């Protein structure tokens, strides 16, 4: 008979300490939950004490036992005699925090054992499930426990320590120049100055109307990151096959007309440039492309983890685009699906400590305004994305709407939400002949 690891002594000590000391409840409150107790009477006692504490009522022996008696739940717990025994047995000079931590650890271990048993039972009786589904199920089961225990890292911090850390960070940024770049280099001077690079562990959202160069801009960023670093760069393309992406990349890097490449009308110099580009790419060998359709966040996260494990770090992750992703459990409501996607992306960004650039799209309502430049509210149906995003960039091109625009070949990257810097608009040159973005050499305002 397997014996699950349960510490009845720790739970009894916690209960006795709470009865004999009501000031420590908060310390217990941040270490254990009601479901963490093995026996049903202990869970019921904790729930009643939580209700009393939230109502302002004392949690002494008489009031707790009486409250259980009034609701008729005293008999299930064990009685006033049992409550008095629990109160009296526990010595006053006890550290409730240690016992609470032991109880907290035991619940995690019990959940792990339950998940292992579920996986084994599912394997023995597949009920038509595939091996891939079982592997995904096991990964999800383990990651659920990991996140269940990955919530203690968030809480209040000391004011003086925060101030000292902020001062140290300011000094360090002014100490190590890097010419204004602290994160992953974007390959553009003005964007680097306004962003200090692409900060690791931050979610980046790129949004625009159709035909604005969103995929083009993302690919230019990816190529710049690959050429200016050594860590691998991963691309998730749910909308294009990898061959078209590579053709676009060849047009951008070799500065050859995309139509010529697509139709094959290339001369000797174009072939030489393409050979040079291929040689550089094969010498570097740090770009990975995944053109699978109907991607799920689990597959994206698993592939990112595998790349980081294989190569010891990821320079940048790119997803195009998140409106094509699916969560099967929440297909009924799109807003819940989007929230789950955003949460999973943020968790992946935190876990791998990498910059993640996810592309998004805007509704037609933006085009109902006289000024079509995007704003934050144009992220309707994706509020969780706007909240969880650490950087938000919108792409705008005036020449798209106006033929006679004076800004032909000029694109605007608008920072609608920046976590660690200022917002503003950056103008760049758009060479659609080469399918590329470049630094703007004209006057800046």
């Amino acid at each position: 008979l397997k014996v699950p690891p349960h510490s009845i002594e720790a739970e009894q000590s916690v209960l006795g300490g709470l009865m004999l000391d009501n000031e420590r409840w908060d310390d217990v409150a941040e270490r254990v939950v009601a479901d963490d107790f093995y026996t049903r009477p202990h869970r019921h006692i904790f729930t009643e004490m939580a209700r009393l504490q939230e109502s302002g009522s004392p949690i002494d022996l008489i009031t707790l036992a009486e409250s259980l008696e009034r609701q008729g739940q005293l008999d299930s717990v064990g009685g006033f005699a049992y409550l008095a025994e629990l109160s009296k047995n526990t010595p006053s000079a006890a550290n409730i925090s240690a016992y609470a931590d032991i109880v907290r650890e035991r619940a995690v271990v019990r959940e792990m054992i339950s998940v292992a048993n579920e996986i084994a039972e599912a394997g023995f009786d597949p009920q038509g499930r595939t091996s891939e589904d079982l592997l995904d199920l096991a990964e999800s089961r383990v990651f659920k426990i990991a996140e269940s225990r990955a919530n203690k890292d968030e809480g209040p911090k000391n004011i003086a320590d925060v101030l000292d850390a902020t001062v140290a960070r300011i000094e360090q940024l002014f100490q190590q120049p890097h010419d204004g770049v602290t994160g992953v280099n974007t390959g553009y001077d003005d964007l680097n100055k306004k962003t200090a690079g692409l900060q690791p562990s931050d979610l980046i959202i790129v949004a625009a109307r159709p035909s604005m160069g969103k995929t083009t801009f993302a690919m230019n960023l990816v190529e710049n990151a690959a050429m200016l670093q050594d860590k691998p760069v991963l691309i998730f393309s749910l909308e294009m096959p990898s061959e078209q992406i590579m053709m676009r990349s060849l047009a951008s890097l070799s500065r050859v007309d995309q139509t010529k490449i697509r139709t094959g009308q290339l001369d000797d110099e174009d072939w030489a440039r393409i050979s040079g580009t291929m040689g550089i790419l094969l010498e570097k060998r740090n770009i990975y492309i995944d053109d699978s359709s109907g991607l799920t966040p689990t597959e994206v996260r698993s592939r990112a983890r595998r790349i980081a494990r294989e190569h010891g770090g990821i320079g940048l992750i790119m997803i195009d685009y998140l409106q094509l992703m699916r969560v099967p459990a929440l297909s009924d409501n799109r807003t819940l699906e989007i929230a789950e996607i955003s949460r999973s992306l943020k968790a992946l960004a935190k876990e791998l400590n990498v910059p993640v650039v996810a592309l998004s799209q805007l509704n037609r309502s933006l085009e109902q305004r006289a000024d079509k430049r995007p704003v934050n509210s144009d992220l309707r149906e994706s509020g969780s994305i706007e909240q969880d995003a650490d950087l938000i960039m919108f792409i705008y091109r005036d020449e798209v709407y106006h033929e006679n625009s004076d800004l032909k070949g000029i694109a605007e990257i608008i920072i609608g939400k920046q976590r660690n810097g200022p917002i503003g608009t950056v103008r760049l040159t758009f060479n659609g002949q080469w399918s590329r973005f470049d630094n703007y050499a004209g006057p800046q305002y």
């Binding site: 320590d161 000292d164 850390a165 001062v167 140290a168 000094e171 360090q172």
Partner: peptide, 22 residues
């Protein structure tokens, strides 16, 4: 200049920065 800025940085680190610091 830069040297004076770094010197003042170190001075402030000594004056207020403690325990963790950098």
């Amino acid at each position: 200049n830069r040297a004076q800025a770094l010197a003042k940085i170190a001075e402030i680190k000594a004056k207020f920065g403690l325990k963790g610091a950098s």
